[PDB]
Amino acid sequence: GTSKLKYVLQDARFFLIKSNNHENVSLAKAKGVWSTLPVNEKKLNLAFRSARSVILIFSVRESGKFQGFARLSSESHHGGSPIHWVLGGVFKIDWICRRELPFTKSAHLTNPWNEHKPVKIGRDGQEIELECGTQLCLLFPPDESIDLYQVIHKM
Template sequence: MVVSAIAPPKATRIPESFFILKSLTSQDLDASVRRGQWTTQEHNEAGLNAAFERAENVYLVFSANKSGEYFGYARMLAPISGDLGAATSPVTSSDVSPDDGPRSIPTPATATAPSGRIIDDSARGTIFWEADDVAEDEDSPLKEQATNDLSAEQELGRPFRIEWISTGRLPFFRTRGLRNAWNANREVKIARDGTELEPVVGRKLMLLFHGVGF
């Protein structure tokens, strides 16, 4: 008797995944719209690639640092791969002198931001601001500002193709009440670069770009 082999069932893919991505400037996002590609921080790549494998569509919601609004959203067209050196042109150790190490520049607290420091590692192409400890109150304006600014460090990885679906601006205040269960139930505006959104909330946020409330 011949027994035919039974192929194992294919893994079921989920319909959608949603992520918040941040940029230092809106000019970088404008350039992304023209080129149809984006380069995220290295530590975000594995999570985005895993989502691309498990989901039919991976949507990326973008905002520029300190803008107080979402810039728009796009869909991943391909996994993140390619030549890392071609994407970032890193500075090698032979190009950096011992005097070119990072500098820490303290910044005082203001009415809109907590105290912190600027880390200037210009020789290696990195400059970012980080906050000192701030209050844990998620509605604190200081925490919201600090969360936006913490996205500033840029250890960029490899470029990947995206399709922009909307570049209509969405102010953060219009998302009030939307909370991300996958980020300690904080409001969606309180997120770091690469934060994944719970899918129901991600869909609601995406619909707001098209004038559909919740």
């Protein structure tokens, strides 16, 4: 079904994350963490405090695809377990979908906060307007390995 997914996304904010390599997205998928540049870290911390869900939608540059999406479970924090990224604070994230979506499937979605360009277009950290972001997340193939019960309880 899609009902719990729609519930998690209700009144959410959405941000495009552009990564330079699959290895870092793989690490994020395995460890449930993300780290970004200071300008985006500040924006995400602000969004985390005000919105009931903040959703990161990931895309590896030149892949032509999104690799999935996740919900922030914390603000950024320093001093924790180190992460062997491929070269700020660390956000904890809960994955909602670890399956890919090709850009060809989102060609009908425009992002008002980026001049109504197709939603695949955007710098790392670009905010995606609510309706566009909701519809983008609903386009991903269902990830039947995920149980959103525990995510709902964190809201």
